[PDB]
Swiss-Prot record, chain A:
Phosphothreonine found at: T13
GO annotation terms (biological process): chromatin remodeling; DNA repair; regulation of DNA-templated transcription
Family: Belongs to the actin family.
Protein name stated in the entry: Actin-related protein 5
InterPro entries (UniProt xref): Actin, ATPase_NBD
Keywords, in A-Z order: Isopeptide bond, Nucleus, Phosphoprotein, Transcription, Transcription regulation, Ubl conjugation
Organism, as annotated: Saccharomyces cerevisiae (strain ATCC 204508 / S288c) (Baker's yeast)
Functional description taken from the UniProt entry: Probably involved in transcription regulation via its interaction with the INO80 complex, a chromatin remodeling complex.
SUPFAM superfamilies linked: Actin-like ATPase domain
Pfam hit, one: Actin
GO MF, one annotated term: enzyme regulator activity
From Swiss-Prot, chain B:
Top-rank lineage group of the source organism: Eukaryota
Official protein name in the record: RuvB-like protein 1
Coiled coil residues, start to end: none
Full-length numbering of the shown residues: 200 to 265 of 463
Misc. comment: Present with 11600 molecules/cell in log phase SD medium.
Family recorded in the similarity comment: Belongs to the RuvB family.
Upper taxonomic lineage: Eukaryota, Fungi, Dikarya, Ascomycota, Saccharomycotina
Compartments it resides in: Nucleus
Function as written in the Swiss-Prot or TrEMBL entry: DNA helicase which participates in several chromatin remodeling complexes, including the SWR1 and the INO80 complexes. The SWR1 complex mediates the ATP-dependent exchange of histone H2A for the H2A variant HZT1 leading to transcriptional regulation of selected genes by chromatin remodeling. The INO80 complex remodels chromatin by shifting nucleosomes. Its ability to induce transcription of some phosphate-responsive genes is modulated by inositol polyphosphates. The INO80 complex is involved in DNA repair by associating to 'Ser-129' phosphorylated H2A histones as a response to DNA damage.
Gene name as annotated: RVB1
Species, as recorded: Saccharomyces cerevisiae (strain ATCC 204508 / S288c) (Baker's yeast)
UniProtKB/Swiss-Prot annotation, chain C:
Note: Present with 1720 molecules/cell in log phase SD medium.
Full protein name: Chromatin-remodeling complex subunit IES6
Top-rank taxon, per record: Eukaryota
Role according to the record: Probably involved in transcription regulation via its interaction with the INO80 complex, a chromatin remodeling complex. Also involved in the regulation of telomere length.
Entire-sequence positions represented here: 57 to 111 of 166
Family: Belongs to the IES6 family.
Subcellular compartments: Nucleus
Residues in coiled coil: none
Quaternary context: Component of the chromatin-remodeling INO80 complex, at least composed of ARP4, ARP5, ARP8, RVB1, RVB2, TAF14, NHP10, IES1, IES3, IES4, IES6, ACT1, IES2, IES5 and INO80.
Gene: IES6
Amino acid sequence: KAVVIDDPPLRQTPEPFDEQSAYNPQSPIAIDFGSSKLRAGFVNHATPTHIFPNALTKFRDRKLNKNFTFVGNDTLLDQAVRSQSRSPFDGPFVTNWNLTEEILDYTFHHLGVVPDNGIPNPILLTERLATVQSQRTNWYQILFETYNVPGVTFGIDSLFSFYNYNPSGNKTGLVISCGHEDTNVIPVVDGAGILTDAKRINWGGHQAVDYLNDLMALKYPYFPTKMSYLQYETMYKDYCYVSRNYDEDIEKILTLENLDTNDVVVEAPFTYDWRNSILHLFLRGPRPHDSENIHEQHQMHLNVERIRVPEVIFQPTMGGQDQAGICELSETILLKKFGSQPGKLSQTSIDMVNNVLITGGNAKVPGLKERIVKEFTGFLPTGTNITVNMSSDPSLDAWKGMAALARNEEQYRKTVISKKEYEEYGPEYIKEHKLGNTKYFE
Amino acid sequence: IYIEANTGAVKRVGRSDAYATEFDLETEEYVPLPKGEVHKKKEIVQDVTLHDLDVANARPQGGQDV
Amino acid sequence: TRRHKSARQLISDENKRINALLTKANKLVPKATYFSVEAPPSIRP
């Protein structure tokens, strides 16, 4: 079995921009202010028209006024402007609001909407769970008096995903989102997301790539070249999966018969028996080390512990966050809440078990589904049927939630806030519709 | 544990594997979780003789069960 | 006027606002805040 090298490079997009001049001045705009990927489009189309990495650069060019090539895949057109590109969206929520105004101005150019006053269409907004009130007042300002929108509603994107795959709007189910930055589990009763009962995990996927960067830097402190963070996401999306059970795998993960198929080695770009030594197997894998070869100094022997970086979702204690994992949150929700006791499930809990939806940008990792169903049947009573659902693209389904609420008109009128209600009630006002945030108090 | 429904024997196998890191060192024998169903039912046949019965219920000193 | 305010500072003065509201309320359990929806620590070792 000869060693194969793996290259870590990402090429550039030669065709960044496209738009259509014709538009409907009555059809609203569906938007998704995603951390990893901004998604845009109309109402009538089933899939989102514009997907963009939600990033901008202020490219400075001498003799031509130093303000060029702001938002989109044109940042991915050159590696230099890709490196200087600044996503404004911070940990909780975005820091730089006029940067967001640049993004909204760019996409309003890219729907081809000819401007009538500020904006002649309703705007369909996505919003993270349990938003800080100052953040929503800034949202109210930037929408209503900066862009003159007739109507804006905002809610939790995974709740819209839950509505999208169960469009009756009154089903009982459990939704577990794994987003870019945080991940959370929300219980839903009768189509209403009970937000007193939900719990949120401060890990996401940003900290997963950060963890992979830190482990790969500490494993090889004397690595010659430095490896880019985009290459870290390439390495994370390519070679990572979730164990069926973590506890018995890690004893077997450095056994010699395992390393033949487990270990895949990455090549960084450039231009005392070993069977007894477990450091040799950890650092250099199943082939003997060639200490003179310039390939081996640039060889990144990962997949010795490829399981460890996805597994920290189920156990955030390796991530440093003292929060219970997804399994314990499911135990508390399904066996201690909504009238269910250990040994006697209430009917709402059984209906929640019957419909479990997982979604988000971090669900693209293989092996999550079988681990989730096995962990669920670990603690549920025997005979309780468990049905867990996956998307083709779990990240793209919040936009279909936008399209679904845009279709359902009698539900759409309940969610939509108006300019008149905003000016009458002030920015400290949120409609307590079921598919969105609730009041801070009763 | 071990519980037989008919006889009523209670046998303690040991503490669970998920409770192994509460302390770094303690006397509790940590056995893993059983991989099968909790409830297992099977039928057997008991071949006894008459003499097994007569020495069962004629003990000069009792306590054959313990 | 628009300056970059720290996300940690945003969590800080959100906490201050709920603390102010609760201290003027009691002298009213919060239904759903950013702190209350944070997951608790695990109970198993």
